[PDB]
């Protein structure tokens, strides 16, 4: 047969590097008076839970509690410019309030594209073609979803 | 062989855009609770987006039982993942 399928539906990311990779967790519990945000009690249970499952899967987990926005970008840039050559991939988790397209650090808004841009191929080359996983536990607005029933 | 700079991201959101997310003060948020429960059961066995679809199903069946303000009682939460992935992702043990 002259036409080989070049996009096999079974194709998988190669997950056979030396390390699994970094998982960062940004746990935001308390906020500046200037932000006017209520304290997210229960989030440490979320953090401890994520750190456990991510360790079970092989990641190196770095959990930060209540960092400022500048410090979040500092730890993001630190991950962005690291050597991911023998990592399978990269995870980044954010536990905060948010809205629009931004989450809150301890003191200030952070657009989610600020979290993601430093890992785009043109900036973090050692991750090109590797999965980059971002998890946002945050409000994205203030609508409520109603309950409906199949008929 | 070139890729987009935007390739192979997956954005996993606890709720749909514009909408609230819900959190238990003892057990943590609905989404992370269910994500970790699915990861515990199938992290090393299933494709990551099938897990997220399971998480989607689990959070979808919950209902706000009681709320510091009662206008969210009986309300729902639908999570949503945005995939820019190009292959199947597994965390099979290594």
């Amino acid at each position: 047969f002259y036409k080989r399928e070049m996009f096999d539906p079974a194709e998988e990311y190669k997950m056979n590097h030396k390390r699994r990779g970094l998982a960062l967790i940004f746990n935001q519990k308390r906020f500046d008076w200037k932000l006017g945000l209520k304290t997210r009690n229960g989030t440490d249970k979320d953090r401890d839970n994520l750190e456990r499952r991510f360790q079970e899967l092989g990641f190196e987990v770095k959990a930060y509690n209540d960092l400022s926005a500048e410090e979040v970008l500092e730890k993001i840039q630190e991950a962005s410019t690291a050597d991911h050559s023998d990592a399978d991939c990269f995870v980044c988790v954010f536990l905060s309030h948010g809205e629009d397209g931004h989450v809150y650090a301890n003191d200030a808004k952070i657009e989610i594209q600020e979290l993601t841009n430093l890992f785009k191929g043109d900036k973090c080359q050692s991750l090109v073609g590797k999965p980059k996983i971002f998890i946002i536990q945050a409000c994205r607005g203030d609508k409520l979803d109603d309950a409906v029933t199949p008929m | 062989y070139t890729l987009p700079a935007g390739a192979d991201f997956i954005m996993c959101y606890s709720t749909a855009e514009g909408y609230y997310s819900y959190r238990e003060t003892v057990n943590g948020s609905w989404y992370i609770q269910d994500l970790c429960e699915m990861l515990k059961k199938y992290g090393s066995e299933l494709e990551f987006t099938e897990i997220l679809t399971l998480v989607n199903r689990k959070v979808s069946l919950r209902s706000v039982p009681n709320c510091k303000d009662p206008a969210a009682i009986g309300k729902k939460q639908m999570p949503c993942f945005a995939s820019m992935l190009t292959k199947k992702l597994y965390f099979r043990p290594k």
Partner: peptide, 4 residues
């Protein structure tokens, strides 16, 4: 349950 809380809102966040």
């Amino acid at each position: 349950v809380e809102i966040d």
